[PDB]
Amino acid sequence: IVGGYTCGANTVPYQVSLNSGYHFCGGSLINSQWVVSAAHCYKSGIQVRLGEDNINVVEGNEQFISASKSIVHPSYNSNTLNNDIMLIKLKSAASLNSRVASISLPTSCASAGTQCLISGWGNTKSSGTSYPDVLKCLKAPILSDSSCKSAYPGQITSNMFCAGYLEGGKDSCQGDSGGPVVCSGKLQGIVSWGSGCAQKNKPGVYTKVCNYVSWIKQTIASN
Amino acid sequence: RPDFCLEPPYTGPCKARIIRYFYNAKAGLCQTFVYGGCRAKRNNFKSAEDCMRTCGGA
Numbered sequence: 001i002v003g004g005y006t007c008g009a010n011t012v013p014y015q016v017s018l019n020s021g022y023h024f025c026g027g028s029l030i031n032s033q034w035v036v037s038a039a040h041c042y043k044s045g046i047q048v049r050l051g052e053d054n055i056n057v058v059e060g061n062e063q064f065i066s067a068s069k070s071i072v073h074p075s076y077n078s079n080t081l082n083n084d085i086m087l088i089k090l091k092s093a094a095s096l097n098s099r100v101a102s103i104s105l106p107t108s109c110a111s112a113g114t115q116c117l118i119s120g121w122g123n124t125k126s127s128g129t130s131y132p133d134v135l136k137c138l139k140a141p142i143l144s145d146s147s148c149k150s151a152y153p154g155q156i157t158s159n160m161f162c163a164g165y166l167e168g169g170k171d172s173c174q175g176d177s178g179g180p181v182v183c184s185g186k187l188q189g190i191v192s193w194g195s196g197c198a199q200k201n202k203p204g205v206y207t208k209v210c211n212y213v214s215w216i217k218q219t220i221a222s223n
Numbered sequence: 224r225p226d227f228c229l230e231p232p233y234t235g236p237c238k239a240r241i242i243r244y245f246y247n248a249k250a251g252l253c254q255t256f257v258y259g260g261c262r263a264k265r266n267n268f269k270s271a272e273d274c275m276r277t278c279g280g281a
């Protein structure tokens with residue numbers, strides 16, 4: 001058993017690719033003009049691609065739109081990775097259809113053992129290298145705070161959660177950062193960091209999106 | 224020239240796929256590698272040229 005599977009074309013319609021000449025990160029569409037991603041995904045000269053499946057061939061459903069603005073959270077800590085969230089304003093509004101559609105923000109935080117979908121074009125090999133053409137999906141449960149903090153002593157803030165399997169072999173990896181963790185339709189997390197990928201007793205760490213909902217709505221409204 | 228230039232490349236713990244440069248002392252040139260977005264070490268350059276200017280000759 002491998003973790004990922006191929007989601008299927010345009011089945012995660014809020015997933016976006018962040019491109020600077022090549023896919024470097026993911027992100028989620030929150031409305032027709034705003035994308036949420038990771039702070040450590042901040043670059044100049046972002047192009048956002050919407051409606052992707054194969055990130056290497058033009059399949060006719062794409063919208064490539066440049067960012068006008070990129071806002072990293074005011075309290076992003078480069079060392080501790082706390083507040084690893086960022087908003088990207090699109091140069092022009094996307095056109096929302098059936099392959100391009102935005103994801104709802106949470107009303108509350110999700111509990112340990114809620115099962116989520118995590119999607120990405122990141123590396124598919126735990127130890128190794130292989131970047132897929134098509135988008136991969138992974139169902140992984142939210143982990144308890146207490147286990148998270150046992151997996152990574154000293155490093156887990158109230159703004160992080162752990163998701164995956166203590167056994168290993170099923171995770172998110174390099175390439176996947178900024179992309180969604182969606183649980184019961186609501187966007188709970190952002191792919192953020194880990195100790196490697198898919199290693200035993202080190203599940204991935206994700207930005208806890210339910211803490212930021214007031215910040216998102218107000219930052220969106222005034223920019 | 225320096226001793227951070229001899230250090231193997233570090234991806235770190237963040238999961239971006241960002242292509243950077245490092246000095247490969249074994250080859251005597253700068254090469255690309257995948258930097259995950261955070262906690263970079265000093266052998267980690269944004270262009271071959273920055274790499275060559277800082278390190279080339281280590």
Ligand SMILES: CC[C@H](C)[C@H](N)C(=O)N[C@H](C(=O)O)C(C)C
Nearest residue numbers: 003004120122124136138170171
């Ligand atoms: C989250 C997107 C997918 C599932 C990532 N990139 C993946 O392919 N992970 C591998 C797995 O099968 O879960 C993992 C690194 C072995």
Ligand SMILES: [Ca+2]
Nearest residue numbers: 054057058059
């Ligand atoms: Ca495509």
